Structures are given as structure tokens and as C-alpha cells.
Point group: C2
Chain length 500, copies 2
């Protein structure tokens, strides 16, 4: 607009007039919090002309009460400080009073020097002697996010962070929560590792990958969909307890709970099974909730702050729902065995139509089972609840159930119908594992884009002996959503993927 | 030529069909092997507590026998070895015949044992076992050490073998964890906030590197993997977060060698109201303190040619030498560069200089790439101890603020150690007019064939138009820092799964 062109013209006039133009360094006397923590309990009207302090922040308010007085609010590091600029106090060596202040606009980052104290009304203030424009804002900013549509908050995240305290709070909470989680596992003697995000062969999750290419090696590559296959090789290597926190990359759908890159944690624990992992998940998550909120019952608004509120209860232990048993309890009928037979496939198709459940493609036993548990089970998980004992056909890297035929020692954690955790007793028998890979390879051949190719390097690693192991993954972003009561993953990711 | 793996598959089939233990789901250990040694490592020779039954587990590193009645194992777990003494008179027959139980065990198997704690008469910390369980067999005949491998490339391609046999490799990755924690703590204590910015970018930028290209099908849009987080991190300072850092992977689609892996771990931080003078001071305090933490002093060994070859000492005592970019080139040439540095007269001059001193000519022959080539020849070669090369020309520093005293230069530094780049930092450019102009010049170089030059990023220019406060920013190559702390001359030693050819 004209505001931007005029600002560029102003800065040109300032550069040519020998006046301060983007100064390289401004030495602040102290932070704005610190200034408030030192002078916040002074008597009203107190000043100290024996002390000169330099302060800086972004201008949020300019009010010229008269020709001799200008009131500024600056803001920085979560603290507001008022500046009172009296013409009688102005340092004429920096320019005439009207000139110096004529160059300051709301939104500018600026520095003031002056004397500390509080005003007569009692508001913490600096009684400024000069003003330095450090970095002008070339755009007319709104007062609050109300003056922006609200997808600007996602596409220009600096504007959300500059005007909206609620958003700064979410990302501070995100860091506090990841700190808590690392500590939890560091205390247990885990070793944090990093495994490749560029893979020759992708695997470890049910997802379509991103495809790329390395020009000097002349080979196609994939971004990792999960670190699982590498992490387990470190247990073969004897590291005993490892974890990784980083990005996965999945090339599929974007919605309220899906962003193409998302932060995941995986850990592998030699000699655990999935029963140890349940106890561990409850201890980790209830403790973090308690740490963050001060109690285990926390509000959650699925439709935003003026919509209905749900109170999620994280009190332990959590409800277990057996995968197949609860589907058959919803159906009033038993699935057909073997679970992956054509008869069962047909029966599940028929039940999905009967219960108005969108059919998947292909109509693999695994995808159909997913649809039925999406309908009959994932809908009962308002409080954190474990969905346990997933069928083998949908769990190619999960070890078989020691007692239930066709099942595995797997669990998923759901909160308010949304997946948070996925874990199992790790499959460590190479023969079965190869066969489950081949069934995956054939499903990919039959239209399952989310099916992974065989990874011979992983089979060879299992042939060197994976000790009995429990492994586990957590979608960190979705965890932040519950901890910060957002219902859109875009709220808990700084620069989410936006359509252009 | 190796029936060992076939027979082991056959052995395990027999076991499965005979109803014998076959890959038990859960083996509950009484304690870890390190806890065991802590509890019992000081008992007398010949001590045995037959009132205490314990379950231990580890990988078998050794099987020896004196009779058909007495078998000696060594098991290893969590950095500790414990001897298992299996006497037939103690053998629990409900688990099977003694000879049958132990003929299923091979060196390399993950196995559990149950028995009585104590020490052999010769004084070895031992469990006197009553049973053995095969938890996870090893189908391959293992070497005793990484010396028994066919090639040492096996250590990178099958890193589980390296970790299994070689304490030295295990120590490297513990040192890597320890150093990263130290670094996080240093910045957490300064009030920094850790952030995560996108590794999928619609527009790559923030470094001189060639990107990987990809595609998101639902968005139907081409994407780049990030070469650096710098342009998103600076937006967060515009945002007012004041002090941010990010520790994560960068992806660069270029050459692989001793100091370059296509993905590597970098740290970037941005500090409102710092300049590069502040950043040099912080670099010195952070890096020297970390070095002291690991090594107990500031003078540490390095073997650029291996552990039996020559050993040099790297001196981290502060303050570190400063080399001025253009001056040090000119002292090594014996004459001055032409001004402006980016003029055709100076491009031509610099071509004459690379040919005279037999410096491999860059392509394309941009002023920046020519100047980089001279610096790498005349300046980086002097950086044995940690040293700052400072005040880089603007033509090679599109995101660095102009130098407050030296025309054509910027307020930038790179940290070199043993001639390898460890850090890159500058007073950040926050003036949108010039930033746009240097962006257009980068697109001009990218057009002449400079695969390192980045295209203009309009989202970032618009961010700077909202006011980036004076700021200092900084990047650290963490893999290369570990190379120096751990004394490795190959980046493959400090990355668990490095990129390997076919
Ligand atoms: C690592 C796993 C553990 C299971 C919960 C969670 C699932 C995961 C699925 C997923 C897929 C995808 O394409 C994009 C996403 O943001 C997510 C996510 O947040 O969560 O993460
Ligand atoms: C973030 C930066 C700051 C300067 C040091 C270091 C440079 C970086 C260059 C680089 C390029 C590349 O293609 C592969 C690599 O492993 C590296 C590396 O380790 O170091 O990291
Ligand atoms: N790879 C799994 C997480 C770990 C499952 C247990 N090994 C996922 O992406 O969902
Ligand atoms: N982006 C730089 C590091 C930060 C430079 C200061 N902004 C690099 O990758 O080398």
C-alpha cells in the first residue's frame, strides 16, 4: 500500500540526512522483565535522575497527549513498559524533539534511554531522553489478531507471535513438554540417538513416503516415514535403551490432526514387553499432565473456546479395550476366522455397509479391520484409553500374542478418538518377519500405497539377534494439542503446511 | 559357502516343533549386569549365596567347557561382563536335559540364565546357573573383534556389528549425547527457547548448498528439503521470541567425503540485540567449556592420520586468533584485490591468481566462489587451533549485515579447527531493500550455473518488512564438533548410519 512506499521513502530520507539508519548494535541496560522486577514496587511518581538506562522493544502504542508529551508502550520478552517522552527532557543532539519522534511508528522496534521510576497514576515508566529507531515496520499492523482472516496467523506466524499472547504460550509449553519427556527417559538411563531421514528403503509405518534423489550418488531416496527399523538395529547392537525425537515425513492427507512433517518420539527398551510399556505410558503422560496443569482432569474444546468443553481425565490406570472383542461387541456378531480370509474380508465389507462405514482401498483385511475399530472402538476413547491386541495382519512388525491366536502384543493409545501412541512387543523372529514383509510387498503391489517394501538390511540385522524388546512411538504434536487445548494441529506447529 | 545360517534356521525349527522355548516374549531379569557387579563384585573368592535365586540376561561372548558336566559362559550387557558357571549337578531338569539345554546355545546368542550369585574360586564374578533360556539366537558366525570383519566398511553398513564388538564406537555415540545435552543446557540457562521449523520448504535458502527436491501429492506442489533453518528462525525474532535455537538435520544434495554427509545435524540460534562480536565471545565460552567438560583441559589430542600415526595438540585457550578474510588472502598473494571485489576487473584478477598459485578454479567463476577458493587456499590452511576468519565480503554473504567500519565487508565470522568449518555466524541483515538486492544477485549466480545460490524468497523479505530487531545468528556443525571432541578424522565415525555407496 501507500504506507509501505512512504516508509521506504522515509528511511531513504533518513539515510541521506546522516541520521541513524538501522544501527548495528543497541546495548540495553537490562531486559524489560528485569526492569519491571527492579522498579515494579516503587512509590507513585518516583523517579531517579541519578540513573540513566537504555531499554528496547517493539512499539505497541503511540499517544501524543499534547505537543509537549508523547506516551509510548514498548513490549519485549513478555513485559510491557511505558515510555514518557517530555520535550523538556529531549536530547537535542539526537535531533529536535518533533523530528526524532516523527520517525517512530507503531510496530517499530526502537530503543529509548531515560530515567527509571513510575508515573503519578502509578504505571511503570521510563522518562526518556532520546529515541532510536532500530528496525521500522513498513506495514500498518492491527491491534490484535482480530484486525488481520485467521490463516494469516499460519502464513505469517511472526504476526501471530507479535500480537497474540496465546500463541507464544503454546510454543513455550511445547518446549516445556519435550524437556519433561527427555528428562523422564534420561533419568531411566536411555541414550538419545539420531537415525537417517534419508533412506534407501522406507518403512516402519503405514504411509506413503516423499521421494527425492541424490545427484552424485545417482540414486532415488525416500524421506523416512518412521525411524523404527534403524532404532531396532541399535538394540541388536546392544545399546539396550534408545530414543529418538524428530520429524517423520508422510506424503498423504492434511487435516486438523495431520501435517506432512510432524514430530515423533520413538524409544526401544530391551527386555520390555507391551505390558511394561502401558504402565510406562501412563506414568509418563499422567505425570506430564499433572506437571503442566496441576491436576489430571483438563479442559478440551473440540469446537473452539466458545463451543462445548470436554474434561479429559488422565487418572491412572487407563481403560483397556481389546481390538477384536469390542468390534464384535459392537457388531453383535463374531468376525470370521482366519481374520485375513476372503470370507472375513467379505463379511467385513458387508458390516461396513450395514453400519455406513466408508470402505477402504484396497479392501484388505487390515484396512477393513481399521475401519471397524475406527467406528466401534476409537469412538469410546474419550479419556486416554488403550486399544490393545491388534490382529497380526495389520501389525507386520509386532510380535505375536503369547496367548491369543492371530493377535499381536500391540497397543495404540487414543485420547478423544485420536491416536497418540503406538507400541508393541517387537517382532524378533526373522522367519515370520520376512513373511510379514512379503505380505506387505504384495499389498503394495495390489494398490496399498501405505504398504512398505521389504528391507533386507533389517532382516539381516534380525538375523544377528534382536533381544526381546518393547518399542513405542508418540505423536508429539497431537500431545501438545491436548495439553494446550487446541483442536487444529496448525496451532502447535510454528510454520504448518499451507495450500497456496 | 555358509551352512551355519541354514542349520540355525533348522535348529530353531526343531525347537519350535518340539514345544521347547522358542523366542520367549518376556524374560524378567532380577537386575542389570552392571547392578549385579555392583552388588557382588566385592565378595570373597568362592562366595556363593545358594539362598538367593537371580535371573540375568546378556549376549554370549564366550563359551568354554572342561567336561560334559561343567560349561563356562561369558555374557555381556550394558557394558558389563558376567561369567555363568553351568554345572550339571545344579541343572533344572524341568527345562530339559542338561546337554540338550546347552547344545542350543552359541556364541552371539541373546540368552537368559537363572542361578546363585557369587564368585568362582579363581575370583571371577559369576552366576552359578540352574537353567539357560535361548531368547534370540544369532544366525551368523561372529568375529571376536572388528578385526575379524571382512572389511571395516562393514562397521558403517551393519552398524549393529560395530556396536556389538567395539567399545570405542559405543563411547563415541555416548559422547555425542553428552555434548548435545551440554549445549542444550548452556542455551536453556540463558533463557533460550527451543523451536522446530519446517524441513519441507516451498523455497530453499539460508546456506550455499544444492537442495534435495521432492513433491507432495495432495498439495500437488514441489517441495525442497531444508538446507538450513535460517530464514524461518529469523521470522521468530520478528515474532518477538527474542532468543531461539534449533538442533536438527539439514539436507544438502552435494558431495560426500570425510567431512560431508548428505544429512547432518546442525544447531542454529538467533539472539535479539546481539552482534557478531557478542557471538564470537559466546562461541569461545561455549566451545571451550564443552572441551574442558569432556577433556579436563583446553589442550586436546588429534590424530589426523589414525591412532598410531602423528598426534597433534589442539589448543582451545581463549581468545582465539582472528584472521581478516580479505587481508589474509592479500598477504598470501603479496598484492591487493581489486575494488569493488565483485567487479569484472577483480573476477578476472582472481582467475589469474588461482591459476598462478595452482588453485582449482571454481565453476561458475563468480566473485564469491573465486574468493572462497582463495580463502580455502591462503587462510583456512592456517586454522589449526580454533580460529575465526572474519569480515567476509558481502558478495559471498547475502544474509549478513554490512560491516559498520569496512566497506564491501560484512559482520560475519566462520570458526575453523584444523582447517575444517565448525561455525558460521553474523550480525543479521535486517534492511529489506539491500536484502532483496543481494537475493536478486544470488538468483543471477544460480542462473550462471551456481548450484549453491538460492532463489529469492518473497515470504522472508515480507517478514523483514515487519521489522527484524538487531540480531545475531549462528550455526554449528555438530557432527564435525564431535569429530574433534572424539578424535575422529572421518564423519562416518560419529553418525550411526552414514550414507554409503551401492
Ligand atoms: C509415530 C506415531 C505414533 C502413533 C501416534 C502418531 C501417529 C501420527 C500419524 C500422522 C500421520 C501423518 O501423515 C501426519 C501426522 O501429523 C501424523 C500424526 O500427527 O500422528 O505418531
Ligand atoms: C550449519 C553449518 C555451520 C558451519 C559449520 C557446518 C558446515 C557444514 C557443511 C556441510 C555440507 C554438507 O553437504 C554436508 C555436511 O555434513 C556439512 C557439514 O558437516 O558441515 O555447519
Ligand atoms: N513405527 C511406529 C512407532 C513404533 C511402534 C513400535 N515399534 C509408528 O510410526 O507408528
Ligand atoms: N545458515 C548458516 C548458519 C547460520 C549463519 C548465521 N545466520 C549455515 O548454514 O551455514
Amino acid at each position: 500500500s501507500h504506507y509501505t512506499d512512504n516508509r521506504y521513502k522515509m528511511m531513504e530520507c533518513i539515510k541521506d540526512a546522516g541520521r541513524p539508519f538501522y544501527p548495528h548494535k543497541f546495548k540495553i541496560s537490562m531486559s524489560l522483565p528485569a526492569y519491571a522486577l527492579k522498579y515494579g514496587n516503587v512509590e507513585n511518581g518516583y523517579i531517579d535522575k541519578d540513573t540513566t538506562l537504555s531499554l528496547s522493544g517493539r512499539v505497541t502504542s503511540i499517544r501524543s497527549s499534547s505537543s509537549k508529551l508523547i506516551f509510548y508502550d514498548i513490549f519485549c520478552e513478555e513485559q510491557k513498559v511505558q515510555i514518557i517522552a517530555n520535550i523538556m527532557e529531549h536530547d537535542i543532539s539526537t535531533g529536535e524533539f518533533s523530528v526524532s519522534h516523527s520517525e517512530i511508528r507503531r510496530g517499530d522496534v526502537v530503543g529509548f534511554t531515560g530515567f527509571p521510576g513510575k508515573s503519578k497514576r502509578g504505571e511503570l515508566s521510563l522518562f526518556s531522553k532520546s529515541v532510536v529507531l532500530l528496525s521500522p515496520c513498513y506495514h500498518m499492523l492491527p491491534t490484535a489478531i482480530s484486525g488481520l482472516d485467521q490463516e494469516v496467523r499460519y502464513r505469517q506466524r511472526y504476526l501471530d507471535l507479535m500480537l497474540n499472547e496465546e500463541s507464544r504460550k503454546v510454543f513455550k509449553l511445547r518446549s516445556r513438554a519435550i524437556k519433561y519427556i527427555r528428562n523422564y527417559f534420561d533419568r531411566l538411563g536411555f541414550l538419545e540417538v539420531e537415525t537417517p531421514m534419508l533412506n534407501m528403503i522406507y518403512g516402519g509405518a503405514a504411509a506413503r513416503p516423499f521421494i527425492t534423489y541424490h545427484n552424485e550418488l545417482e540414486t532415488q531416496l525416500y524421506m523416512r516415514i518412521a525411524p523404527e527399523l534403524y532404532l531396532k538395529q541399535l538394540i541388536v547392537g546392544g545399546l539396550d535403551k534408545v530414543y529418538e525425537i524428530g520429524k517423520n515425513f508422510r506424503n498423504e492427507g492434511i487435516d486438523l490432526t495431520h501435517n506432512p512433517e510432524f514430530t515423533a518420539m520413538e524409544f526401544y527398551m530391551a527386555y520390555a514387553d507391551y505390558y511394561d510399556l502401558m504402565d510406562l505410558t501412563e506414568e509418563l503422560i499422567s505425570g506430564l499432565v499433572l506437571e503442566i496443569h496441576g491436576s489430571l482432569k483438563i479442559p478440551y474444546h473440540p469446537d473452539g473456546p466458545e463451543g462445548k468443553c470436554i474434561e479429559i481425565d488422565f487418572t491412572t490406570p487407563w481403560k483397556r479395550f481389546s481390538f477384536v472383542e469390542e468390534i464384535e461387541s459392537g457388531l453383535g456378531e463374531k468376525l470370521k476366522r482366519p481374520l485375513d480370509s476372503q470370507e472375513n474380508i467379505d463379511f467385513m465389507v458387508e458390516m461396513c455397509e450395514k453400519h455406513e462405514i466408508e470402505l477402504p482401498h484396497p479392501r484388505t483385511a487390515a484396512k477393513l479391520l481399521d475401519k471397524l475399530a475406527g467406528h466401534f472402538v476409537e469412538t469410546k476413547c474419550t479419556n486416554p484409553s488403550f486399544i490393545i491386541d491388534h490382529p497380526q495382519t495389520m501389525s507386520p512388525l509386532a510380535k505375536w500374542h503369547r496367548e491369543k491366536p492371530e493377535m499381536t502384543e500391540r497397543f495404540e493409545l487414543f485420547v478423544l478418538g485420536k491416536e497418540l501412541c503406538n507400541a508393541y512387543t517387537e517382532l524378533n523372529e526373522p522367519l515370520q518377519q520376512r513373511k510379514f514383509f512379503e505380505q506387505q510387498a504384495d499389498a503394495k503391489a495390489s494398490g496399498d500405497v501405505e504398504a512398505c517394501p521389504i528391507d533386507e538390511t533389517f532382516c539381516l540385522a534380525l538375523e544377528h539377534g534382536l533381544p526381546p524388546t518393547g518399542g513405542w512411538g508418540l505423536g508429539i504434536d497431537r500431545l501438545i494439542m491436548f495439553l494446550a487445548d487446541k483442536n487444529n494441529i496448525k496451532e502447535v506447529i510454528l510454520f504448518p503446511a499451507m495450500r497456496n
